[PDB]
């Protein structure tokens, strides 16, 4: 298991424009297009993202290309963020993947808002971080995915994904 396999499990793959768990137009492997209610705004963001006239449909290679870019961007967002970088640097390789997963899902600013959890993660108080992580809109809205990520932080293993 690695971050790619992990997010592919959590996000799925769809080759036509769909709405994510929040109702936002999305494509591929959780690639958010726009938060706008307009399918035409989504189709336009998609053509721009892929560099061709797609009419709402992409190929698997195209979906994996956006995915690679998004994982890379999630890692870059962590390393650029004053609150996220020290936590990431403190973590082992498996728990780092858990942090990337959160940033991919909710963005750098959203995760940097988990001040208390991040501190507990940096201190390696795993059971406590896991309890605090769960007291979140994140956990209440997407409990199955959140539980898998939280388990990864708690155990430092891939057991929730195997
Ligand atoms: Cl893009
Ligand atoms: Cl879920």
JSON list of C-alpha atoms and ligand atoms in Angstrom, two decimals:
[
{"chain": "A", "resi": 1, "resn": "UNK", "atom": "CA", "xyz": [0.00, 0.00, 0.00]},
{"chain": "A", "resi": 2, "resn": "UNK", "atom": "CA", "xyz": [1.04, 3.63, -0.62]},
{"chain": "A", "resi": 3, "resn": "UNK", "atom": "CA", "xyz": [-0.68, 7.09, -0.83]},
{"chain": "A", "resi": 4, "resn": "UNK", "atom": "CA", "xyz": [-1.80, 6.45, -4.40]},
{"chain": "A", "resi": 5, "resn": "UNK", "atom": "CA", "xyz": [-3.44, 3.10, -3.66]},
{"chain": "A", "resi": 6, "resn": "UNK", "atom": "CA", "xyz": [-4.95, 4.58, -0.45]},
{"chain": "A", "resi": 7, "resn": "UNK", "atom": "CA", "xyz": [-6.61, 7.58, -2.17]},
{"chain": "A", "resi": 8, "resn": "UNK", "atom": "CA", "xyz": [-7.78, 5.38, -5.06]},
{"chain": "A", "resi": 9, "resn": "UNK", "atom": "CA", "xyz": [-9.67, 3.29, -2.46]},
{"chain": "A", "resi": 10, "resn": "UNK", "atom": "CA", "xyz": [-11.06, 6.37, -0.72]},
{"chain": "A", "resi": 11, "resn": "UNK", "atom": "CA", "xyz": [-11.96, 8.35, -3.85]},
{"chain": "A", "resi": 12, "resn": "UNK", "atom": "CA", "xyz": [-12.88, 5.71, -6.42]},
{"chain": "A", "resi": 13, "resn": "UNK", "atom": "CA", "xyz": [-12.54, 6.39, -10.16]},
{"chain": "A", "resi": 14, "resn": "UNK", "atom": "CA", "xyz": [-15.27, 7.87, -12.36]},
{"chain": "A", "resi": 15, "resn": "UNK", "atom": "CA", "xyz": [-14.61, 8.95, -15.95]},
{"chain": "A", "resi": 16, "resn": "UNK", "atom": "CA", "xyz": [-17.64, 11.17, -16.31]},
{"chain": "A", "resi": 17, "resn": "UNK", "atom": "CA", "xyz": [-18.38, 14.34, -14.30]},
{"chain": "A", "resi": 18, "resn": "UNK", "atom": "CA", "xyz": [-20.10, 13.44, -11.00]},
{"chain": "A", "resi": 19, "resn": "UNK", "atom": "CA", "xyz": [-21.00, 15.15, -7.77]},
{"chain": "A", "resi": 20, "resn": "UNK", "atom": "CA", "xyz": [-18.82, 14.41, -4.73]},
{"chain": "A", "resi": 21, "resn": "UNK", "atom": "CA", "xyz": [-20.10, 13.81, -1.16]},
{"chain": "A", "resi": 22, "resn": "UNK", "atom": "CA", "xyz": [-20.68, 17.56, -0.77]},
{"chain": "A", "resi": 23, "resn": "UNK", "atom": "CA", "xyz": [-22.54, 17.85, -4.10]},
{"chain": "A", "resi": 24, "resn": "UNK", "atom": "CA", "xyz": [-19.63, 19.49, -5.98]},
{"chain": "A", "resi": 25, "resn": "UNK", "atom": "CA", "xyz": [-18.79, 18.67, -9.60]},
{"chain": "A", "resi": 26, "resn": "UNK", "atom": "CA", "xyz": [-15.81, 16.36, -9.64]},
{"chain": "A", "resi": 27, "resn": "UNK", "atom": "CA", "xyz": [-14.08, 13.96, -12.04]},
{"chain": "A", "resi": 28, "resn": "UNK", "atom": "CA", "xyz": [-11.59, 11.06, -12.07]},
{"chain": "A", "resi": 29, "resn": "UNK", "atom": "CA", "xyz": [-10.08, 10.18, -8.70]},
{"chain": "A", "resi": 30, "resn": "UNK", "atom": "CA", "xyz": [-11.67, 12.87, -6.54]},
{"chain": "A", "resi": 31, "resn": "UNK", "atom": "CA", "xyz": [-10.48, 15.76, -8.71]},
{"chain": "A", "resi": 32, "resn": "UNK", "atom": "CA", "xyz": [-12.74, 18.69, -7.71]},
{"chain": "A", "resi": 33, "resn": "UNK", "atom": "CA", "xyz": [-13.72, 20.85, -10.69]},
{"chain": "A", "resi": 34, "resn": "UNK", "atom": "CA", "xyz": [-15.78, 23.68, -9.24]},
{"chain": "A", "resi": 35, "resn": "UNK", "atom": "CA", "xyz": [-18.03, 24.41, -6.29]},
{"chain": "A", "resi": 36, "resn": "UNK", "atom": "CA", "xyz": [-20.40, 26.16, -8.66]},
{"chain": "A", "resi": 37, "resn": "UNK", "atom": "CA", "xyz": [-23.87, 24.59, -9.27]},
{"chain": "A", "resi": 38, "resn": "UNK", "atom": "CA", "xyz": [-23.37, 24.96, -13.04]},
{"chain": "A", "resi": 39, "resn": "UNK", "atom": "CA", "xyz": [-22.54, 21.84, -15.03]},
{"chain": "A", "resi": 40, "resn": "UNK", "atom": "CA", "xyz": [-21.31, 24.16, -17.79]},
{"chain": "A", "resi": 41, "resn": "UNK", "atom": "CA", "xyz": [-18.92, 25.82, -15.38]},
{"chain": "A", "resi": 42, "resn": "UNK", "atom": "CA", "xyz": [-17.71, 22.25, -14.52]},
{"chain": "A", "resi": 43, "resn": "UNK", "atom": "CA", "xyz": [-17.35, 21.22, -18.17]},
{"chain": "A", "resi": 44, "resn": "UNK", "atom": "CA", "xyz": [-15.32, 24.39, -18.81]},
{"chain": "A", "resi": 45, "resn": "UNK", "atom": "CA", "xyz": [-12.98, 23.74, -15.80]},
{"chain": "A", "resi": 46, "resn": "UNK", "atom": "CA", "xyz": [-12.57, 20.18, -17.03]},
{"chain": "A", "resi": 47, "resn": "UNK", "atom": "CA", "xyz": [-11.58, 21.18, -20.59]},
{"chain": "A", "resi": 48, "resn": "UNK", "atom": "CA", "xyz": [-9.07, 23.63, -19.08]},
{"chain": "A", "resi": 49, "resn": "UNK", "atom": "CA", "xyz": [-7.69, 20.94, -16.72]},
{"chain": "A", "resi": 50, "resn": "UNK", "atom": "CA", "xyz": [-7.23, 18.38, -19.54]},
{"chain": "A", "resi": 51, "resn": "UNK", "atom": "CA", "xyz": [-6.31, 20.79, -22.37]},
{"chain": "A", "resi": 52, "resn": "UNK", "atom": "CA", "xyz": [-8.99, 19.62, -24.82]},
{"chain": "A", "resi": 53, "resn": "UNK", "atom": "CA", "xyz": [-12.70, 19.70, -25.49]},
{"chain": "A", "resi": 54, "resn": "UNK", "atom": "CA", "xyz": [-13.91, 16.83, -23.33]},
{"chain": "A", "resi": 55, "resn": "UNK", "atom": "CA", "xyz": [-17.69, 17.22, -23.06]},
{"chain": "A", "resi": 56, "resn": "UNK", "atom": "CA", "xyz": [-17.59, 15.84, -19.50]},
{"chain": "A", "resi": 57, "resn": "UNK", "atom": "CA", "xyz": [-15.80, 12.59, -20.25]},
{"chain": "A", "resi": 58, "resn": "UNK", "atom": "CA", "xyz": [-12.10, 11.71, -19.78]},
{"chain": "A", "resi": 59, "resn": "UNK", "atom": "CA", "xyz": [-9.96, 8.63, -20.27]},
{"chain": "A", "resi": 60, "resn": "UNK", "atom": "CA", "xyz": [-8.36, 6.59, -17.50]},
{"chain": "A", "resi": 61, "resn": "UNK", "atom": "CA", "xyz": [-4.87, 7.94, -18.39]},
{"chain": "A", "resi": 62, "resn": "UNK", "atom": "CA", "xyz": [-6.26, 11.49, -18.10]},
{"chain": "A", "resi": 63, "resn": "UNK", "atom": "CA", "xyz": [-7.82, 10.70, -14.71]},
{"chain": "A", "resi": 64, "resn": "UNK", "atom": "CA", "xyz": [-4.50, 9.28, -13.45]},
{"chain": "A", "resi": 65, "resn": "UNK", "atom": "CA", "xyz": [-2.65, 12.34, -14.71]},
{"chain": "A", "resi": 66, "resn": "UNK", "atom": "CA", "xyz": [-4.85, 14.71, -12.68]},
{"chain": "A", "resi": 67, "resn": "UNK", "atom": "CA", "xyz": [-4.50, 12.34, -9.73]},
{"chain": "A", "resi": 68, "resn": "UNK", "atom": "CA", "xyz": [-0.71, 12.45, -9.89]},
{"chain": "A", "resi": 69, "resn": "UNK", "atom": "CA", "xyz": [-0.86, 16.26, -10.02]},
{"chain": "A", "resi": 70, "resn": "UNK", "atom": "CA", "xyz": [-3.29, 16.41, -7.10]},
{"chain": "A", "resi": 71, "resn": "UNK", "atom": "CA", "xyz": [-1.25, 14.11, -4.86]},
{"chain": "A", "resi": 72, "resn": "UNK", "atom": "CA", "xyz": [1.86, 16.17, -5.72]},
{"chain": "A", "resi": 73, "resn": "UNK", "atom": "CA", "xyz": [-0.07, 19.38, -4.90]},
{"chain": "A", "resi": 74, "resn": "UNK", "atom": "CA", "xyz": [-1.28, 17.95, -1.58]},
{"chain": "A", "resi": 75, "resn": "UNK", "atom": "CA", "xyz": [2.38, 17.11, -0.61]},
{"chain": "A", "resi": 76, "resn": "UNK", "atom": "CA", "xyz": [3.48, 20.62, -1.73]},
{"chain": "A", "resi": 77, "resn": "UNK", "atom": "CA", "xyz": [0.67, 22.24, 0.33]},
{"chain": "A", "resi": 78, "resn": "UNK", "atom": "CA", "xyz": [1.83, 20.39, 3.47]},
{"chain": "A", "resi": 79, "resn": "UNK", "atom": "CA", "xyz": [5.50, 21.36, 2.98]},
{"chain": "A", "resi": 80, "resn": "UNK", "atom": "CA", "xyz": [4.61, 25.02, 2.36]},
{"chain": "A", "resi": 81, "resn": "UNK", "atom": "CA", "xyz": [2.30, 25.28, 5.38]},
{"chain": "A", "resi": 82, "resn": "UNK", "atom": "CA", "xyz": [3.81, 26.36, 8.69]},
{"chain": "A", "resi": 83, "resn": "UNK", "atom": "CA", "xyz": [1.38, 24.23, 10.69]},
{"chain": "A", "resi": 84, "resn": "UNK", "atom": "CA", "xyz": [1.49, 21.10, 8.54]},
{"chain": "A", "resi": 85, "resn": "UNK", "atom": "CA", "xyz": [5.18, 20.77, 7.69]},
{"chain": "A", "resi": 86, "resn": "UNK", "atom": "CA", "xyz": [6.49, 20.14, 11.26]},
{"chain": "A", "resi": 87, "resn": "UNK", "atom": "CA", "xyz": [3.83, 17.50, 11.81]},
{"chain": "A", "resi": 88, "resn": "UNK", "atom": "CA", "xyz": [4.56, 15.72, 8.50]},
{"chain": "A", "resi": 89, "resn": "UNK", "atom": "CA", "xyz": [8.36, 15.83, 9.19]},
{"chain": "A", "resi": 90, "resn": "UNK", "atom": "CA", "xyz": [7.75, 14.25, 12.64]},
{"chain": "A", "resi": 91, "resn": "UNK", "atom": "CA", "xyz": [5.69, 11.33, 11.23]},
{"chain": "A", "resi": 92, "resn": "UNK", "atom": "CA", "xyz": [6.69, 7.86, 9.95]},
{"chain": "A", "resi": 93, "resn": "UNK", "atom": "CA", "xyz": [5.94, 7.00, 6.30]},
{"chain": "A", "resi": 94, "resn": "UNK", "atom": "CA", "xyz": [2.52, 5.40, 6.86]},
{"chain": "A", "resi": 95, "resn": "UNK", "atom": "CA", "xyz": [1.13, 8.22, 9.01]},
{"chain": "A", "resi": 96, "resn": "UNK", "atom": "CA", "xyz": [2.50, 10.77, 6.50]},
{"chain": "A", "resi": 97, "resn": "UNK", "atom": "CA", "xyz": [0.19, 9.13, 3.94]},
{"chain": "A", "resi": 98, "resn": "UNK", "atom": "CA", "xyz": [-2.72, 9.72, 6.32]},
{"chain": "A", "resi": 99, "resn": "UNK", "atom": "CA", "xyz": [-1.91, 13.41, 6.48]},
{"chain": "A", "resi": 100, "resn": "UNK", "atom": "CA", "xyz": [-1.66, 13.63, 2.67]},
{"chain": "A", "resi": 101, "resn": "UNK", "atom": "CA", "xyz": [-5.08, 11.90, 2.44]},
{"chain": "A", "resi": 102, "resn": "UNK", "atom": "CA", "xyz": [-6.68, 14.58, 4.69]},
{"chain": "A", "resi": 103, "resn": "UNK", "atom": "CA", "xyz": [-5.13, 17.48, 2.70]},
{"chain": "A", "resi": 104, "resn": "UNK", "atom": "CA", "xyz": [-6.19, 15.90, -0.60]},
{"chain": "A", "resi": 105, "resn": "UNK", "atom": "CA", "xyz": [-9.77, 15.68, 0.72]},
{"chain": "A", "resi": 106, "resn": "UNK", "atom": "CA", "xyz": [-10.21, 18.92, 2.55]},
{"chain": "A", "resi": 107, "resn": "UNK", "atom": "CA", "xyz": [-7.32, 21.17, 1.50]},
{"chain": "A", "resi": 108, "resn": "UNK", "atom": "CA", "xyz": [-4.33, 22.66, 3.30]},
{"chain": "A", "resi": 109, "resn": "UNK", "atom": "CA", "xyz": [-6.32, 25.32, 5.16]},
{"chain": "A", "resi": 110, "resn": "UNK", "atom": "CA", "xyz": [-8.96, 22.81, 6.34]},
{"chain": "A", "resi": 111, "resn": "UNK", "atom": "CA", "xyz": [-6.39, 20.41, 7.78]},
{"chain": "A", "resi": 112, "resn": "UNK", "atom": "CA", "xyz": [-4.28, 23.23, 9.33]},
{"chain": "A", "resi": 113, "resn": "UNK", "atom": "CA", "xyz": [-7.49, 23.96, 11.30]},
{"chain": "A", "resi": 114, "resn": "UNK", "atom": "CA", "xyz": [-7.08, 20.67, 13.23]},
{"chain": "A", "resi": 115, "resn": "UNK", "atom": "CA", "xyz": [-4.71, 22.46, 15.65]},
{"chain": "A", "resi": 116, "resn": "UNK", "atom": "CA", "xyz": [-5.19, 20.18, 18.64]},
{"chain": "A", "resi": 117, "resn": "UNK", "atom": "CA", "xyz": [-5.06, 16.92, 16.60]},
{"chain": "A", "resi": 118, "resn": "UNK", "atom": "CA", "xyz": [-1.89, 18.05, 14.84]},
{"chain": "A", "resi": 119, "resn": "UNK", "atom": "CA", "xyz": [-0.22, 18.82, 18.15]},
{"chain": "A", "resi": 120, "resn": "UNK", "atom": "CA", "xyz": [-1.20, 15.38, 19.47]},
{"chain": "A", "resi": 121, "resn": "UNK", "atom": "CA", "xyz": [0.11, 13.79, 16.28]},
{"chain": "A", "resi": 122, "resn": "UNK", "atom": "CA", "xyz": [3.43, 15.64, 16.62]},
{"chain": "A", "resi": 123, "resn": "UNK", "atom": "CA", "xyz": [3.65, 14.38, 20.26]},
{"chain": "A", "resi": 124, "resn": "UNK", "atom": "CA", "xyz": [2.87, 10.80, 19.11]},
{"chain": "A", "resi": 125, "resn": "UNK", "atom": "CA", "xyz": [-0.16, 10.61, 21.42]},
{"chain": "A", "resi": 126, "resn": "UNK", "atom": "CA", "xyz": [-1.94, 8.38, 18.90]},
{"chain": "A", "resi": 127, "resn": "UNK", "atom": "CA", "xyz": [-5.05, 7.29, 20.82]},
{"chain": "A", "resi": 128, "resn": "UNK", "atom": "CA", "xyz": [-5.70, 10.89, 21.90]},
{"chain": "A", "resi": 129, "resn": "UNK", "atom": "CA", "xyz": [-5.21, 12.31, 18.37]},
{"chain": "A", "resi": 130, "resn": "UNK", "atom": "CA", "xyz": [-7.62, 9.71, 17.05]},
{"chain": "A", "resi": 131, "resn": "UNK", "atom": "CA", "xyz": [-10.31, 10.75, 19.58]},
{"chain": "A", "resi": 132, "resn": "UNK", "atom": "CA", "xyz": [-9.81, 14.47, 18.74]},
{"chain": "A", "resi": 133, "resn": "UNK", "atom": "CA", "xyz": [-9.75, 13.84, 14.95]},
{"chain": "A", "resi": 134, "resn": "UNK", "atom": "CA", "xyz": [-13.19, 12.20, 15.24]},
{"chain": "A", "resi": 135, "resn": "UNK", "atom": "CA", "xyz": [-14.76, 15.30, 16.84]},
{"chain": "A", "resi": 136, "resn": "UNK", "atom": "CA", "xyz": [-15.11, 16.98, 13.48]},
{"chain": "A", "resi": 137, "resn": "UNK", "atom": "CA", "xyz": [-17.58, 17.74, 10.72]},
{"chain": "A", "resi": 138, "resn": "UNK", "atom": "CA", "xyz": [-15.18, 15.63, 8.60]},
{"chain": "A", "resi": 139, "resn": "UNK", "atom": "CA", "xyz": [-15.81, 12.50, 10.67]},
{"chain": "A", "resi": 140, "resn": "UNK", "atom": "CA", "xyz": [-19.57, 13.06, 10.94]},
{"chain": "A", "resi": 141, "resn": "UNK", "atom": "CA", "xyz": [-20.06, 13.66, 7.19]},
{"chain": "A", "resi": 142, "resn": "UNK", "atom": "CA", "xyz": [-17.76, 10.90, 5.86]},
{"chain": "A", "resi": 143, "resn": "UNK", "atom": "CA", "xyz": [-17.42, 8.46, 8.80]},
{"chain": "A", "resi": 144, "resn": "UNK", "atom": "CA", "xyz": [-16.19, 5.35, 6.91]},
{"chain": "A", "resi": 145, "resn": "UNK", "atom": "CA", "xyz": [-13.36, 7.16, 5.12]},
{"chain": "A", "resi": 146, "resn": "UNK", "atom": "CA", "xyz": [-12.49, 9.25, 8.19]},
{"chain": "A", "resi": 147, "resn": "UNK", "atom": "CA", "xyz": [-12.34, 6.06, 10.35]},
{"chain": "A", "resi": 148, "resn": "UNK", "atom": "CA", "xyz": [-9.89, 4.47, 7.87]},
{"chain": "A", "resi": 149, "resn": "UNK", "atom": "CA", "xyz": [-7.64, 7.59, 7.96]},
{"chain": "A", "resi": 150, "resn": "UNK", "atom": "CA", "xyz": [-7.93, 7.91, 11.75]},
{"chain": "A", "resi": 151, "resn": "UNK", "atom": "CA", "xyz": [-7.02, 4.20, 12.16]},
{"chain": "A", "resi": 152, "resn": "UNK", "atom": "CA", "xyz": [-3.94, 4.78, 10.03]},
{"chain": "A", "resi": 153, "resn": "UNK", "atom": "CA", "xyz": [-2.88, 7.65, 12.35]},
{"chain": "A", "resi": 154, "resn": "UNK", "atom": "CA", "xyz": [-3.62, 5.56, 15.44]},
{"chain": "A", "resi": 155, "resn": "UNK", "atom": "CA", "xyz": [-1.79, 2.36, 14.40]},
{"chain": "A", "resi": 156, "resn": "UNK", "atom": "CA", "xyz": [0.79, 3.46, 11.86]},
{"chain": "A", "resi": 157, "resn": "UNK", "atom": "CA", "xyz": [-0.20, 0.43, 9.74]},
{"chain": "A", "resi": 158, "resn": "UNK", "atom": "CA", "xyz": [-2.32, -0.12, 6.61]},
{"chain": "A", "resi": 159, "resn": "UNK", "atom": "CA", "xyz": [-4.76, -2.47, 8.34]},
{"chain": "A", "resi": 160, "resn": "UNK", "atom": "CA", "xyz": [-7.83, -0.32, 7.59]},
{"chain": "A", "resi": 161, "resn": "UNK", "atom": "CA", "xyz": [-7.03, -0.60, 3.87]},
{"chain": "A", "resi": 162, "resn": "UNK", "atom": "CA", "xyz": [-6.19, -4.33, 3.63]},
{"chain": "B", "resi": 1, "resn": "LIG", "atom": "CL1", "xyz": [-6.10, 21.20, -12.83]},
{"chain": "B", "resi": 2, "resn": "LIG", "atom": "CL1", "xyz": [-17.02, 7.85, 4.12]}
]
